[PDB]
Design a protein around this ligand. Structure first.
Ligand code: CL
Lengths: 210, 223
């Protein structure tokens, strides 16, 4: 085939997949060894009983649509498009597909140094929550933060979903429900790129990942 | 009987507290009504800032308040889904204003009626049991966000969005949780988001609120 969209490495790493016979963003594995080790791949090869398959279309009932996720096609990073499936993930363990958990996704903006809003809806959420992810601590920045300098030394930045700061590019409308407190200050447990993270939201709508 | 009138909170949310005639509001001398915003059932042109409650429309900008709790004299009555409880017409500086769209509280909090208004509401409650019925996980009670929910205390604040502690005696608690008595089918259109969570902006009793929905899990209002 011509190739498929595929996860940013963090997504597969957080699911416990590090090697690939075919995907350049992961550690190379000889294809001869893929039958005997878990691999992330775009080839739904039944000879590889432990595999995380990324595909353009579903391949099984348990295929997970990864919507608005950053992704890669060959060497190139693409930004998530809100409401559009970036890729499907199907996890096989000993030949059997497994139900994957729900999660929100990083958008790929960090990887390509994009500081722009994905759409007007995101812009409006930011405007309504001016103390969410702008380095306020009682720091954590969204890629769209008004206080992020143009030149960030990458070496010293901690990425949320895995320091100088912590950095996130989550589509803000996926977090909006969390960012207005029901009653009190709250520390949410949530899944981002299949990794458990903590989102701290103070009564004054100051918010950051821990 | 006579003219139905809003629950106090509806008028308060529009900036009206004084009334020359309505007992549920702060009494104002009629001679001062030309100088204060007044909620009233009298469409008196001498009171240029006034919120007129009427049984029938009085202007093109009269807003039908459908299914809202209401008062006639000192008695509070439940709203009936799909039936107009009263009309509201807001005048600022003598000119009728367009009122925005809103959902309405049903009067259940004020009379302490904790029953479903009909089978349709019961059914909506059952479609999101965490949100509207409530449940217990360990020492934590989740999702008691309606006047019909479990684990509620005996005194509920008379508010559009009430804040309350909830208890499963000897088992679980939650210190603060928001609660309304809105007719749950009014929210149906907001309860099936494509996304795993969504924040809707809307009005409840003319107060700007947000409805947070988590797909197939929970929903609650926030001020
Ligand atoms: Cl909840």
């Amino acid at each position: 085939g011509s190739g498929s969209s595929s996860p940013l490495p963090k997504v597969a790493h957080n699911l416990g997949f590090y090697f690939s016979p075919d995907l350049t963003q992961f550690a190379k594995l000889p294809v001869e060894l893929a039958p005997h080790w878990p691999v992330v791949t775009t080839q739904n090869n039944e000879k590889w009983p432990d595999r995380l398959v990324a595909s353009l279309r579903p391949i099984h009932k348990y295929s997970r649509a990864c919507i608005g996720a950053g992704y890669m096609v060959g060497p190139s990073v693409f930004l998530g498009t809100p409401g559009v499936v970036s890729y499907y993930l199907t996890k096989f363990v000993k030949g059997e597909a497994q139900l994957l958990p729900e999660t929100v996704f990083s958008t790929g903006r960090i990887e390509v140094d994009c500081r722009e809003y994905l759409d007007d809806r995101e812009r409006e959420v930011a405007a309504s929550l001016p103390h969410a992810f702008i380095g306020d601590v009682k720091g954590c920045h969204h890629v769209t933060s008004r206080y992020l300098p143009r030149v960030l030394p990458k070496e010293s930045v901690a990425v949320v979903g895995v320091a100088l700061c912590t950095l996130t590019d989550v589509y803000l409308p996926d977090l909006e429900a969390y960012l207005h407190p029901e009653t009190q200050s709250k520390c949410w447990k949530m899944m981002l790129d299949f990794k458990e993270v903590r989102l701290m939201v103070w009564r004054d709508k100051t918010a950051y990942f821990q």
